[PDB]
Design an enzyme around this catalytic site. Structure first.
Site, PDB file in Angstrom:
ATOM      1  N   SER A  46       2.239 -15.342 -13.258  1.00 13.98           N
ATOM      2  CA  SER A  46       3.570 -15.637 -12.723  1.00 13.98           C
ATOM      3  C   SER A  46       4.684 -14.689 -13.206  1.00 13.98           C
ATOM      4  O   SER A  46       5.807 -14.765 -12.747  1.00 13.98           O
ATOM      5  CB  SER A  46       3.963 -17.080 -13.010  1.00 13.98           C
ATOM      6  N   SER A 107       8.185 -21.572 -12.184  1.00 13.74           N
ATOM      7  CA  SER A 107       7.004 -20.886 -11.694  1.00 13.74           C
ATOM      8  C   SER A 107       6.379 -21.583 -10.501  1.00 13.74           C
ATOM      9  O   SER A 107       5.148 -21.603 -10.367  1.00 13.74           O
ATOM     10  CB  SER A 107       5.967 -20.727 -12.809  1.00 13.74           C
TER      11      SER A 107
END
Length: 277
Positions: A46, A107
């Site tokens: 991420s 995220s």
């Protein structure tokens, strides 16, 4: 000073951990980042949502997108996603800005992919990142693709130089307008993700603008446990630290402590200089 003693300290923190640990450190007196494992390709996981946000906010600055512009999220049409937990019902609308918040601060994987759909996908991100003069990174895949086959995350990679390079371009504030820059910073500071990672062994209250990445555990192993960001020093100058722990056989907490330790090494080194005027 003795910068090579900073590197020495970091080698001793990593040595005999059962993982490949990439490191970039870029202090405010350094013309170059200190790099550890500069030849390896580190899966970004991420961490790439920081890159993506820069692409999105750039297109906002260009008038191609709007921050309040709206996106119809259809639940039957679309993995880790606070946005999907927050909204009730089969269909709802979210502003681009909200998509960025979910992606950068939480995220959120669904928000990420929806942002990909607006900017031209992974190859558009790839070409963005190259446009900045950052050569040693690749983006080939979005979140859904990575969820389908977990070898795919290795295709979304950065070197540590390229990790450093993207943190500098972010921190220097020359890529985005004032409004866009202030928002990305805010999302990156106000995240609650990775409290034990760059922030882990720093004084409580230290401002750290950062983005995490964490693959799942497979095969007893953890492909990527990452954290990249800007630590604000108590003279108000930036300290860029990225630590990517790859193909680790170690416990989750150990992987996180590796990141905390390196970042605390760099920060204390910087404190020590300040302590001496």
């Amino acid at each position: 000073a003795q910068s090579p003693l900073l590197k020495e300290q970091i080698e001793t923190i990593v040595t005999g951990k059962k993982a490949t640990v990439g490191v970039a450190v870029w202090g405010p007196d350094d013309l170059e980042p200190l790099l550890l494992n500069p030849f390896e390709k580190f899966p970004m996981q991420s961490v790439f949502k920081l890159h993506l946000a820069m692409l999105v906010l750039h297109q906002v600055d260009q008038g191609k997108l709007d921050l309040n512009q709206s996106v119809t999220v259809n639940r039957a049409a679309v993995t880790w996603s606070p946005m999907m937990k927050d909204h009730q019902g089969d269909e709802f609308t979210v502003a681009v800005q909200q998509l960025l918040q979910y992606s950068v601060s939480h995220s959120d994987n669904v928000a990420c992919d929806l942002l990909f759909e607006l900017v031209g996908g992974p190859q558009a991100l790839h070409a963005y990142i190259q446009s900045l003069g950052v050569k040693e990174a690749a983006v080939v895949a979005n979140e859904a693709q990575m969820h389908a086959d977990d070898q795919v995350q290795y295709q979304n990679w950065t070197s540590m130089k390229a990790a450093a390079q993207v943190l500098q371009k972010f921190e220097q504030k020359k890529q985005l307008s004032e409004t866009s820059q202030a928002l990305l910073w805010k999302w990156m500071v106000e995240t609650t993700t990775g409290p034990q990672r760059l922030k882990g062994l720093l004084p409580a209250g230290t401002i750290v603008a950062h983005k995490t990445g964490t693959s799942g555990v497979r095969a007893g192993k953890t492909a990527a446990t990452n954290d990249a960001g800007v630590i604000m020093l108590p003279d108000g100058r930036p300290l860029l630290v990225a630590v990517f722990v790859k193909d680790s056989a170690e416990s989750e907490r150990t992987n996180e402590a590796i990141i905390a330790q390196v970042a605390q090494a760099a920060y204390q080194f910087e404190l020590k200089k300040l302590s001496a005027v």
